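hey can u run this one w/ NAP bound, need the structure tokens asap thx
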Amino acid sequence: ASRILLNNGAKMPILGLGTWKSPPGQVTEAVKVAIDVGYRHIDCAHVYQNENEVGVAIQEKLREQVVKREELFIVSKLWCTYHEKGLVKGACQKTLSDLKLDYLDLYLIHWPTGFKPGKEFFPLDESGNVVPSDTNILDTWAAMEELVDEGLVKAIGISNFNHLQVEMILNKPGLKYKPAVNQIECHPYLTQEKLIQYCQSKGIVVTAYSPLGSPDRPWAKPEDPSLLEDPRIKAIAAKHNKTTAQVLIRFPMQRNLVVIPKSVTPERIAENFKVFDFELSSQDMTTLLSYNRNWRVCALLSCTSHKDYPFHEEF
Ligand SMILES: NC(=O)c1ccc[n+]([C@@H]2O[C@H](COP(=O)([O-])OP(=O)(O)OC[C@H]3O[C@@H](n4cnc5c(N)ncnc54)[C@H](OP(=O)(O)O)[C@@H]3O)[C@@H](O)[C@H]2O)c1
Ligand SMILES: O=C(O)Cc1nn(Cc2nc3cc(C(F)(F)F)ccc3s2)c(=O)c2ccccc12
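ok here u go:
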């Protein structure tokens, strides 16, 4: 099926459009094209600085009656500088205002690490270390739970939480709502078997980000691995008469993951959606899993001393 049941009883489309790095000038048309060709899930964040322009598209398509709001699954995320309890509602309300929505389908704690509040997204000390906030993830979660109880969001979740962090939420004293989703980096170079099996065993749906290896990440280097140019992946695509990107989006779908490829290129937006008409074989799946190398796109150096940095640990 094209949608997966979450623990809040709502259904989530397993293919969504990513919006990180989509320039503000091109993301409105990008989202329009996406909705036009089938996408019903959009992955957003305040930190991406383009939620206004995303919302312009959603609103035009709602006004145009191309789609109904109930048919849309719009995801945003709470940025690290707003983990304080007094700041969570306003952060969510800013996002809703910019997206031109009265609710989000899903609102994630974006990273487990809280940073000092201020106008700066990445407040640093004079030596380049991120300035933490003394907020912890459990209190941030109570704040997220309040958003459900106020009708601003239909589901809450986390993002970039390791197994021990997930476990801390599930084991939170007085837990009122379990997390619906954990959104983590996942592709054939970072396969996450252990963390995914842990989350799924607990009824937490996993969304895979950077499924193409985020070739437009601004810190990419010549010697980094490249998924889209991996001849072993290209061969698998050739076998199926599909593109390499199509294989890389179908791969997580078959692991019962949600996947959110980003493009602002209309022909790639459409290509990326044409992944429901073919199957990878079990052997194809194990073969792609074998390319794991624990290679991470998203793991900023300046953040490695935060007490709650999620990637020292095994998973
Ligand atoms: N939770 C978090 O911490 C977190 C972190 C990272 C990402 N995410 C979410 O996940 C989304 C996807 O990850 P991502 O943006 O890092 O990268 P991605 O989706 O792995 O890669 C996007 C890059 O691939 C290109 N591309 C897309 N389709 C292609 C195709 N069919 N053939 C060739 N190239 C193609 C895009 O180019 P064009 O755009 O020029 O077409 C862009 O350069 C984000 O945008 C964001 O919504 C969340
Ligand atoms: O955030 C996205 O969606 C994409 C994303 N990733 N990264 C790499 C990051 N690595 C982190 C590591 C931690 C850590 F938790 F590990 F400390 C905390 C926060 C971050 S941001 C960025 O620096 C970034 C900057 C602007 C907009 C989006 C991003």
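Residues 85-99 form the longest helix (15 residues). anyway lmk if its weird
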